[PDB]
């Protein structure tokens, strides 16, 4: 049971998601489809190849042809951002599942708003310094953060993570954290986060000087 890892389209458009199986699973058995919103359990969309449970709108449909099955989603809405899974039964009539397809909604380009946060005095008193750069509500996902400390490029001492696509406005946000020891943090003045994104005509820098707060 294979499906493509991702699909994308604009709101209002249609997508299809295919599930390729074999003669002994899909070829012989009913197919089900599930929607998994981030952080939630899978939810049944389609059963018996093409039937909708109560509560599922007719924007969703399923069909089966030979050893493959297809889920169609029309009238795409921002709420449809999710992982989609097919499921069927194998030759022993035990459940098997596809690898999942992540649906991305295409929206207009949006530049991030950037914020920088010095370490709290509370954390410094514990012996460590985390400096945080926030890139809020941007699209598309690709974004670059460069850290500088007294104009020294920082390489290898930051980590970042990115939210799932927002259910309401289809944007991403990203946080980057620069880790320094307390002793190193107190050796330097200027802490800067430079952000590159296609929504920005040139890179944006947010900075602070240690001791302003």
């Amino acid at each position: 049971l294979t499906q493509p890892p991702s699909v994308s389209a604009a709101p209002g458009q249609k997508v299809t998601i295919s599930c390729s199986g074999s003669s002994s699973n899909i070829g012989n058995n009913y197919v089900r489809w599930y929607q998994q919103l981030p952080g939630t359990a899978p939810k049944l969309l389609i059963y018996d190849n093409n039937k909708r449970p109560s509560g599922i709108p007719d924007r969703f449909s399923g069909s089966k042809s030979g050893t493959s099955a297809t889920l169609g989603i029309t009238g795409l809405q921002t709420g449809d951002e999710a992982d989609y899974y097919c499921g069927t039964w194998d030759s022993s009539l035990n459940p098997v599942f596809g690898g999942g397809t992540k649906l991305e909604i295409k929206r207009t380009v949006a530049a991030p708003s950037v914020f920088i946060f010095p370490p709290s005095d509370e954390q410094l008193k514990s012996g460590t310094a985390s400096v945080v750069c926030l890139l809020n509500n941007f699209y598309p996902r690709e974004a670059k953060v460069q850290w500088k400390v007294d104009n020294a490029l920082q390489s290898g001492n930051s980590q970042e993570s990115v939210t799932e696509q927002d259910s309401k406005d289809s944007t991403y946000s990203l946080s980057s954290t620069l880790t320094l020891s307390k002793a190193d943090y107190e050796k330097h003045k200027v802490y800067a986060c430079e952000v590159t994104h296609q929504g920005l005509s040139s890179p944006v820098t947010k900075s602070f000087n240690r001791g302003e707060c």
Partner: protein, 211 residues
């Protein structure tokens, strides 16, 4: 009908993973079957096993020698025991059952690791016409932590990031919210942090800094 997993979030290598599924609003005797399905982080779904109406059980052949699924009618719950676990068994475990539409539990993350439970420290990300503020939830193990704002009253504009695994082997997570800058003087912002494996709950007020 509601299903709810419970059980340790951390299991040591070679030890046995034990989970229970509490079924509320329905009797275990009246289900077509009850079963378990797991999902390693960032991956797909894998069926573990099912127990049917009669009591007959069927397990995933690649797991069979390690799996036991049982029903406790008196407590209206069923269970999973997976013996001799390794890192490969780290996953979100779902209980599920059929009363066409199967019911699912909310899932519970089980991490298999020799590392020990550690509660987080919570630090403010203070704000100083939109302002951003947040909380840094640092140095905990295993996942997950949950974060809410103002006890669930504040949801608009909240972003809670995926945890990052630090080089120390501990996780860190940030949660942020953007609010009107004119609110900072009058509105209180509290991040509610819960790390169940360490039984650590913290309500942290994030106060604007003096800059």
């Amino acid at each position: 009908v509601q299903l709810q997993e419970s059980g340790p979030g951390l299991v040591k290598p070679s030890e046995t993973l034990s989970l229970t599924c509490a079924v509320s609003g329905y009797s275990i005797s009246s289900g077509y079957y009850w079963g378990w399905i797991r999902q390693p982080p960032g991956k797909g779904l894998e069926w573990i096993g099912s127990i049917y109406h009669s009591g007959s059980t069927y397990y995933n052949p690649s797991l069979k020698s390690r799996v036991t699924i049982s029903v406790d009618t008196s407590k209206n719950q069923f269970s999973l025991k997976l013996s001799s676990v390794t890192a490969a068994d780290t996953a979100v475990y779902y209980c599920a059952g059929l009363t066409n539409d199967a019911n699912w539990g909310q899932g519970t993350l089980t991490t298999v690791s020799s590392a020990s439970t550690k509660g987080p420290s919570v630090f403010p990300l203070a704000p100083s016409g939109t302002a951003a503020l947040g909380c840094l939830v640092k140095d905990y193990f295993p996942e997950p932590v949950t974060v809410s704002w103002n006890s669930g009253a504040l949801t608009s504009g909240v972003h809670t990031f995926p945890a990052v695994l630090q080089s120390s082997g501990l996780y860190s997570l940030s949660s942020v919210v953007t609010v009107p800058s004119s609110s900072l003087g009058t509105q209180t912002y509290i991040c509610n942090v819960n790390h169940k494996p360490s039984n650590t709950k913290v309500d942290k007020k994030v106060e604007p800094k003096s800059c």
